[PDB]
From Swiss-Prot:
The gene is TLN2. Transmembrane segments: none annotated. Interacts directly with PIP5K1C. It is found in: Cytoplasm; Cell junction, Focal adhesion; Synapse; Cell membrane. This is Talin-2. It comes from the Eukaryota. As a major component of focal adhesion plaques that links integrin to the actin cytoskeleton, may play an important role in cell adhesion. Recruits PIP5K1C to focal adhesion plaques and strongly activates its kinase activity. Residues 88-391 form the FERM domain. Residues 301-391 are annotated as: Interaction with PIP5K1C.
Amino acid sequence: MVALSLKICVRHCNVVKTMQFEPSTAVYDACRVIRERVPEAQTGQASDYGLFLSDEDPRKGIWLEAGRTLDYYMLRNGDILEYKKKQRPQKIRMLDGSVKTVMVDDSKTVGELLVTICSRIGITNYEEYSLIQETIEEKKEELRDERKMEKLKAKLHTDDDLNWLDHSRTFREQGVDENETLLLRRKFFYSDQNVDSRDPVQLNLLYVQARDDILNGSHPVSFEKACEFGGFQAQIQFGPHVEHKHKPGFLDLKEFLPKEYIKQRGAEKRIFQEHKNCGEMSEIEAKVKYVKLARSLRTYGVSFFLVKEKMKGKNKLVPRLLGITKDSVMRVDEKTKEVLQEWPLTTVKRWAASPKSFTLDFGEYQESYYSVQTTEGEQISQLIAGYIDII
């Protein structure tokens, strides 16, 4: 056996403890023993702490990965590690021009951090955003051949393109130090500006809408997804999940699930399960995840009609949901809310509506013409006409 004797720094090296570890000791078990040996090292929980090894440069430092082993960073007897809190302040200029000091996990890449930074502000399309190392240097202390050239070069000036950050790296790896102020800026332009939020006020309007169509049945979701929304909703109205308070029977299921799922077994348990999955996320962050979850579903922004159709060789209708949206028409299982088939609107050749049925003709000679028994055939005809007439 070889013993690895290390000094452990706790609370900014206010406490230095000499301890003995195996070289092959995993980093987490090392953190586990540090917690359970030094009483000064039991603040909060282990998720907010880790082992930090400083490099030759005081601005270069490495956080040990839990899955790795102490030996992996080539630690020899006498070396020092810090049991360091990873949440550290970082000043970032928001979308409203104000510089805000936010806590960031120093161990995470700026790509992962941007997910928590923007969504806590209300941005729903946080993927399209990034950060810039902003530089301010504008406060000055204090001919026919050569400068004719100097006026073309001065008028033909460089574009000093934006100094974005690398999402694959952390703040320490890219040279961004603690008390520097960064600027939040949108980098990509794929979604429209009028369909996303940037402040909590316009975000709440998105959430209030999305929750309404889910709860009144306008947006058909499956029972599993319904409790995932309920889990988010519970976080919004009650905060982080607490096992000993949010007990069975605590909820009013009507305010949380569609009507068809209130009676289904295990509803409150699955809601509470997703509630503690959120952890300690904020209400604003919870609203962002609720909205993005609704938009992620293929049934988002689709008007559905409860119709009846035939399947293979069984002379009996099946309850189906007929979806009509701005670009496509789809079949949806009424119980599981799965998308069984989908046609783009471009392919719809012609349609017909009876007082008892509704027929569709695609290019495919397919199987007959897709026909469904419905009392709202003319209603469906008006809707898809308003889509194809104006395209």
